[PDB]
Design a protein around this ligand. Structure first.
Ligand code: SRM
Ligand code: SF4
Ligand SMILES: O=S([O-])[O-]
Ligand code: NA
Length: 472
C-alpha cells in the first residue's frame, strides 16, 4: 500500500498518466483506489518496485510524505464549491497548511512527533463534503465579496472507537472562534503544538486531540492556542451546511469552464468487462485541458473543461461506463477498503457495498423513495475509515458478515449515530431497514432526512455529548 500526499485532491493530468501506468504495471491489484481523504492508493506493490514508486511520484512532483504515520495526514479542501471562484484561494490555503505542518526532517511536530495522526481540512460552506467532524483541525472559510477574509476554527473531531470500550468514542469538532486570514498558519501551528504537548503519549487509544480536549477542556485548550499564536479569537462568524455529497454530472464553473464529477463506486478504478473505467480515465487525461480533483466521497472531478470540450470528454466517460447512471442512494453511500488488503479488517466493506446497495435500492423502490437518499456507510472495523460514525445509517464491522448497526446521524454530518443493533448479519440488517424506511417514507415531514426522522420518531436516542452519552 502506498498513499500519496495530495492537498485538496488536486492532481494534474500529467501526474495522472504517471500513476495510471505504475498502478497497471507494478502492483498486484493493478488498480487506483481513490480514498475518502482526497488522494489515492496503490495496493500490492512488489518490494522491488518500492524504490521506483517514490521516483515515479517525485518525477511528476508528487510525494508520499506523512501519509501514514503519527503526523499530519492529507489536508482536505471542498472540491466543487457552489461559488466556483472561492476554490482557488481555499485550495491555496489547504496547500499552505499542508506544507507548514510537514516535518522538517521538528519545531512543530517535535522529535517524538505527534501522539497520534492529525487530520486537517479547509471547508467552504454550505458544503461539508470533507466531513469536518471526522477531523482534528478544521478551517471553515468565511468569504465576503467573493474573497476569503478568514476562517472559523473547529477542533477535536475523530471517529475511531474500540468495540465495547466505553473509554473510546467518536467526537465532533468544537468551535474555537474566528481568525483573520493572516493568522492562519500561526493558529494551525499553535493547535498542533498544544496537542503535541498535552496529548496523552502513554496510551495510544487516548492520544487523539478529541481526548485531550475532553481532559483539559475546550476553553483551556483555546486559551493556550491564543497564548501560543499571539492572537485572541474573535466570535464565530455565521456558517451553515446543506449537504456532503458530490455534484455528480456537469456543473458550470467560472467563465466558460465546466466540471464533470464522475461517480466511481468505492473509488476503485480498474478495467472491468465492458466497463474500462481505468482506460477511459487515461483517455480523458490525455485530452483534458486542466486538472482532476479527487473528492472526499472517493469520486473524481474532471475540472475546468471548456464548454467546447464537453462533448469530447462526455463521449469517452460515457463509453467507458464512467457515466453509468446510478440511484441517488448509491451516490450517497460509502465504504472503506477492508478486505482483502486491510490487516485490521473484521467484516467486508468495499466488496460488500455494491450488492448491499443493490438490496437497499430495492427497498427504496418498494417504498416509493427511489429518488431519495440516506447517507449510508459501511466501515470494516471500528477504526472507522468508512466514516460510518457520521452517517445517518452506519454499519460497523464486528466479525465476518456481522456488523453493528448505527442510526441517527444527519445529512450534513454534525451528529454521531448511536448503536441500534449489535453484531447482526446482512439479512438481519436489511429486515430492520426495510421496516425503518417504510416508516420514514410514510411518516416523514417535508424534506425530512432519515437520520433526523429516526431521532424525532423516537426510534433512536440522539448522541448529544459523545464523550458522555455515545455508549448505552
Ligand atoms: C483508504 C482509507 C478508507 C477508504 O476507503 O477511503 C483508509 C484505510 C486505512 N486506514 Fe484509515 N483510511 C481512510 C480514512 C480514515 C478515516 C476517515 C477520514 O480520515 O476522513 C478515519 C476516521 C476518522 C479518524 O481518524 O478518527 C480513519 C481511521 C483509521 C484508524 C483509527 C485511527 C484512530 O484514531 O484510532 C486506523 C488505525 C490506526 O491508525 O491505528 C486506520 C488505519 C488504516 C489502514 C492504513 C490500515 C492499517 O493501519 O494498516 C487502512 C488501509 C486499508 C487498505 O488496505 O487500503 N484508519 N481512516 C482512507 C485513507 C485516507 C487517506 O488517504 O489519508
Ligand atoms: S475501518 Fe478498519 S477495515 Fe476499514 S480500512 Fe479502516 S482499518 Fe481497515
Ligand atoms: O490511516 S487512515 O487514517 O487512513
Ligand atoms: Na465514489
Amino acid at each position: 500500500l502506498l498513499r500519496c500526499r495530495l492537498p485538496g485532491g488536486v492532481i494534474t493530468t500529467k501526474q495522472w498518466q504517471a500513476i495510471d501506468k505504475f498502478a497497471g504495471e507494478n502492483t498486484i491489484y493493478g488498480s487506483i483506489r481513490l480514498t475518502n481523504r482526497q488522494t489515492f492508493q496503490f495496493h500490492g506493490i512488489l518490494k522491488k518496485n518500492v524504490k521506483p514508486v517514490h521516483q515515479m511520484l517525485h518525477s511528476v512532483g508528487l510525494d508520499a510524505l506523512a501519509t501514514a504515520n503519527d503526523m499530519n495526514r492529507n489536508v482536505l479542501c471542498t472540491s466543487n464549491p457552489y461559488e466556483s471562484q472561492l476554490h482557488a484561494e481555499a485550495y491555496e490555503w489547504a496547500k499552505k497548511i499542508s506544507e507548514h505542518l510537514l516535518p522538517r526532517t521538528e519545531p512543530i511536530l517535535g522529535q517524538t512527533y505527534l501522539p497520534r495522526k492529525f487530520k486537517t481540512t479547509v471547508v467552504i460552506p454550505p458544503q461539508n463534503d470533507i466531513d469536518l467532524h471526522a477531523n482534528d483541525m478544521n478551517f471553515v472559510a468565511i468569504a465576503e465579496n467573493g474573497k476569503l477574509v478568514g476562517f472559523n476554527l473547529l477542533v477535536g473531531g475523530g471517529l475511531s472507537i474500540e468495540h465495547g470500550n466505553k473509554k473510546t468514542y467518536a467526537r465532533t469538532a468544537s468551535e474555537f472562534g474566528y481568525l483573520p486570514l493572516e493568522h492562519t498558519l500561526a493558529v494551525a501551528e499553535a493547535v498542533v503544538t498544544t496537542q503535541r504537548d498535552w496529548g496523552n503519549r502513554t496510551d495510544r487509544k487516548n492520544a487523539k486531540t478529541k481526548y485531550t480536549l475532553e481532559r483539559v477542556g475546550v476553553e483551556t485548550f483555546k486559551a493556550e492556542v491564543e497564548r501560543r499564536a499571539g492572537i485572541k479569537f474573535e466570535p464565530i462568524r455565521p456558517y451553515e451546511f446543506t449537504g456532503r455529497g458530490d455534484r455528480i454530472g456537469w456543473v458550470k464553473g467560472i467563465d466558460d469552464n465546466w466540471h464533470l464529477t464522475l461517480f466511481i463506486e468505492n473509488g476503485r478504478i480498474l478495467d472491468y468487462p465492458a466497463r474500462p473505467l481505468k482506460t477511459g480515465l487515461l483517455e480523458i487525461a490525455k485530452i483534458h485541458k486542466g486538472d482532476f480533483r479527487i473528492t472526499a466521497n472517493q469520486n473524481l472531478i474532471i475540472a475546468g473543461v471548456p464548454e467546447s470540450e464537453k462533448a469530447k470528454i462526455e463521449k469517452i466517460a460515457k463509453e467507458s461506463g464512467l457515466m453509468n447512471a446510478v440511484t441517488p442512494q448509491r451516490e450517497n453511500s460509502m465504504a472503506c477498503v477492508s478486505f482483502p488488503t486491510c490487516p485490521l479488517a473484521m467484516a467486508e466493506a468495499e466488496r460488500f457495498l455494491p450488492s448491499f446497495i443493490d438490496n437497499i435500492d430495492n427497498l427504496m423502490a418498494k417504498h416509493g423513495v427511489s429518488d431519495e437518499h440516506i447517507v449510508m456507510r459501511v466501515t470494516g472495523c471500528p477504526n472507522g475509515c468508512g466514516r460510518a460514525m457520521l452517517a445517518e445509517v452506519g454499519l460497523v464491522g464486528k466479525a465476518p458478515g456481522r456488523y453493528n448497526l448505527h442510526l441517527g446521524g444527519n445529512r450534513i454530518g454534525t451528529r454521531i449515530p448511536r448503536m441500534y443493533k449489535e453484531n447482526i448479519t446482512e439479512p438481519e440488517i436489511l429486515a430492520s431497514l426495510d421496516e425503518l424506511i417504510g416508516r420514514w417514507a410514510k411518516e416523514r415531514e417535508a424534506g425530512e432526512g432519515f437520520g433526523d426522522f429516526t431521532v424525532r420518531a423516537g426510534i433512536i436516542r440522539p448522541v448529544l455529548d459523545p464523550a458522555r452519552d455515545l455508549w448505552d
